Design a protein around this nucleic acid. Structure first.
Ligand SMILES: CN[C@@H]1[C@H](O[C@H]2[C@H](O[C@H]3[C@H](O)[C@@H](O)[C@H](NC(=N)N)[C@@H](O)[C@@H]3NC(=N)N)O[C@@H](C)[C@]2(O)C=O)O[C@@H](CO)[C@H](O)[C@H]1O
Ligand SMILES: [K+]
Ligand SMILES: [Mg+2]
Ligand SMILES: [Mg+2]
Ligand SMILES: [Mg+2]
Ligand SMILES: [Mg+2]
Ligand SMILES: [Mg+2]
Ligand SMILES: [Mg+2]
Ligand SMILES: [Mg+2]
Ligand SMILES: [Mg+2]
Ligand SMILES: [Mg+2]
Ligand SMILES: [Mg+2]
Ligand SMILES: [Mg+2]
Ligand SMILES: [Mg+2]
Ligand SMILES: [Mg+2]
Ligand SMILES: [Mg+2]
Ligand SMILES: [Mg+2]
Ligand SMILES: [Mg+2]
Lengths: 137, 122, 117, 74, 86
RNA sequence: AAACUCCAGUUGACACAAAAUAGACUACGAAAGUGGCUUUAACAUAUCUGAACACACAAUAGCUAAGACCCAAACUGGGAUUAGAUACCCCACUAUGCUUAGCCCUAAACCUCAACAGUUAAAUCAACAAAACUGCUCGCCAGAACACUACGAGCCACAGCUUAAAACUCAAA
């Protein structure tokens, strides 16, 4: 067949398998790319925490956490703890427009993990709560 | 006037679904309604998870009830659908067939605005 | 379809409140803006990160990280050529859109007339 | 420019003068300096094209009226 | 929260080419407007400032469309001079 | 830096708050103002004009009383910068913003371009801006400053609002 960019809906039967596992079963890599930090947490299909890493947990301080090298370092630290539990294929769910939004995705690949999808779950309200006032800096 | 009751019932068996529709159609007649038809849109999966009466629903039955009733019967029937435990979500809207559609002749081209600034040599 | 301008600006015939409040008159100019400078993309960063990670493990010895250095070296050579090729070629080469200097010679041959003569 | 060659030849053919080139400001209103004090300006100007290349009236239309020269124009 | 996961804003990776997937996803968010919306939602934009920006963006479009419409209309006249010498 | 560390991330449950896209639309309404869904009621006038004060409305802020509370946030406190910093930057939190019931009656309430009817000819027109005019009517204005003042009156307003002078002074604004 051809190749579609839309994810295979669970209900309808498909033929796309990864290591004999359906798309639903693949573990999920929740990335929260903030402006001053980047936390990464890998979970299974049944929401079971397997690995957690962040720039702070890798020995970075203050303004070094909001860089692209600290997010990549955090991906290698989470892709090395989850590869010992039998994780190879993951579903990336990026949340945030921070510096370590794409650099953490590269770090997960530098740990032996293969990314099959890229999901964006950045919080966008349909007017809800009021942000802080604009600054003059 | 003529209204349309978009009713989303809880996924149940045939005996329980028919008892709910009858109980719901009798409430309209008691408020002065003249039911006209009862269409079934079928049971499908909801677009989003609906939480009603301490229950999280993922499926439901879609039924339309076209009827005639006085203006005062709409507000009294909306309070009857909020207490029914087998009615996930139910909204009353004016029937779309009582709104004639004006004939259209097509798209009218719009010419750029003219004489917006003085014809002077700036 | 360019947005409309009917009943947008504050005028005498328009009874309704203005929709637009332009600070510069909406009259086409006889020139375009100059293309801005691009920030640019840093090159040979992945080769530069695996070469400095080997030094830490090997205590900054250039005898055990030889393979990594070549990746960072060969890349620099290729990247340097691209910068020279890109700057000269873009101006001389005609691709896609024209440049302002040549595009303003075309707009000055067909100037916009917001006056009568 | 398309008919510049044709007009110049006809002017030569009919023993008359032509100017199909860029009009330097002052040919008429400043002829004394440019050509000389004893110069004789045209008695009749025939405009085969009254507009310039920027779709505006030729300057000679107004410069011939200042010097009270009768003009013919298409 | 109440919608199905892994449908919205999801792109599948072809032959491990993550770069192309991230560029496609970022092109979906920029064309839809989410990227700029998230940048203006970090600090509250007062109504008066938000109305001044919409007018600026609407007058910029109008101008840019007409200038482009004239550049495409006069690009036919960018050919060689046919009356070279006259 | 301080702060927090019953903190953070995933999942699930869960609002008296606020209403992405559409909207490149240009609508409603007297204006103020109005952009989530449904329903009910509902949008003056068969000549025009017509009020600081009559009659009725009027953003935000604010008072009084009783509730609510996600977030934001004057004040205040802490941290930093600085010659100093009663500020800009960071954190936390309050009045307040919300609802109900009363009040207050202000704005760069400015599309600074009155209402109605009409014209595009003639001298187009100081300048700029949003081309220039005609008829009719109401309102207002006659150097600057003193003066969004003082006094007086009126007002649920008591550090208030409306209306609103003069003297001294300059030869400019
Ligand atoms: C043409 N005259 C201009 C004018 O001069 C004026 C100027 O007049 C000043 C008055 O004496 C003073 O009391 C007055 N002071 C006040 N406190 N009212 C000045 O404001 C005033 N200057 C002015 N209006 N520009 O000083 C006076 C002596 C002057 O020379 C009289 O003729 O104003 C001067 C600037 O103040 C200009 O330099 C002159 O060119
Ligand atoms: K204004
Ligand atoms: Mg301006
Ligand atoms: Mg909304
Ligand atoms: Mg009246
Ligand atoms: Mg009066
Ligand atoms: Mg008043
Ligand atoms: Mg008020
Ligand atoms: Mg209040
Ligand atoms: Mg707060
Ligand atoms: Mg302080
Ligand atoms: Mg509070
Ligand atoms: Mg206003
Ligand atoms: Mg009036
Ligand atoms: Mg005065
Ligand atoms: Mg005042
Ligand atoms: Mg007073
Ligand atoms: Mg008084």
């Amino acid at each position: 067949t051809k190749f579609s960019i839309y994810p295979p809906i669970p209900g309808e039967e498909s033929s796309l398998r990864w290591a004999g596992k359906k798309f639903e079963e693949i573990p999920i890599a929740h990335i929260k790319a903030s402006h001053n930090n980047t936390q990464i947490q890998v979970v299974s299909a049944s929401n079971e925490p397997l690995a957690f890493a962040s720039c702070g947990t890798e020995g970075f301080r203050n303004a070094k956490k909001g860089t692209g090298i600290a997010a990549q370092t955090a991906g290698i630290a989470a892709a090395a703890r989850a590869k010992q539990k039998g994780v190879i294929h993951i579903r990336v769910v990026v949340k945030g427009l921070g510096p370590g939004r794409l650099s953490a995705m590269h770090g997960l690949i530098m740990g032996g993990l293969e990314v099959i999808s890229i999901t964006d779950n950045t919080p966008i309200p349909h007017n809800g709560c009021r942000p802080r006032k604009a600054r003059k800096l | 006037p003529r209204y349309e009751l978009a009713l989303i019932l809880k996924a149940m068996q045939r005996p329980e679904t028919a008892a709910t529709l009858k109980r719901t159609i009798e409430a309209l007649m008691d408020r002065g309604a003249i039911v006209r038809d009862l269409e079934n849109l079928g049971e499908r999966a909801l677009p989003y998870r609906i939480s009603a009466h301490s229950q999280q629903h993922n499926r439901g039955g879609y039924f339309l009830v076209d009827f005639y009733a006085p203006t005062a019967a709409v507000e009294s029937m909306v309070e009857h659908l909020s207490r029914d435990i087998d009615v996930i979500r139910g909204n009353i809207v004016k029937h779309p067939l009582t709104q004639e559609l004006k004939e259209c002749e097509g798209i009218v081209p719009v010419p750029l605005a003219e004489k917006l600034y003085s014809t002077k040599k700036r | 379809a360019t947005p409309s301008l009917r009943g947008r600006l504050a005028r005498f015939g328009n009874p309704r409140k203005p929709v637009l409040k332009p600070n510069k008159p909406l009259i086409l100019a006889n020139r375009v803006g100059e293309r801005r400078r691009e920030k640019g993309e840093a090159t040979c960063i992945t080769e530069m990160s695996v070469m400095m990670a080997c030094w830490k493990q090997n205590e900054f010895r250039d005898d055990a990280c030889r393979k990594e250095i070549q990746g960072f070296l060969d890349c620099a050579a290729r990247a340097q050529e691209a910068r020279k090729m890109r700057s000269i070629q873009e101006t001389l080469g005609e691709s896609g859109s024209l440049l302002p200097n040549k595009l303003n010679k075309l707009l000055q041959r067909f100037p916009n007339k917001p006056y009568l003569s | 420019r398309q008919f510049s060659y044709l007009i110049e030849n006809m002017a030569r053919d009919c023993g008359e003068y032509a100017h199909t080139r860029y009009f330097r400001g002052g040919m008429l209103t400043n002829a004394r300096l440019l050509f000389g004090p004893t110069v004789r300006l045209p008695d009749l100007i025939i405009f085969l094209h009254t507009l310039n290349n920027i779709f505006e009236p030729h300057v000679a239309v107004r410069d011939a009226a200042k010097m009270n020269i009768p003009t013919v124009g298409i | 929260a109440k919608h199905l996961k892994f449908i919205a804003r999801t792109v599948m990776v072809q032959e491990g080419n993550v770069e192309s997937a991230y560029r496609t996803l970022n092109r979906i968010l920029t064309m839809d407007g989410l990227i700029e919306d998230i940048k203006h939602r970090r600090y509250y934009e007062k109504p008066c400032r938000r109305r001044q920006r919409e007018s600026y963006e609407r007058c910029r479009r109008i101008y840019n469309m007409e200038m482009a419409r004239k550049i495409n209309f006069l690009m036919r006249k960018n050919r060689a001079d046919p009356w070279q010498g006259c």
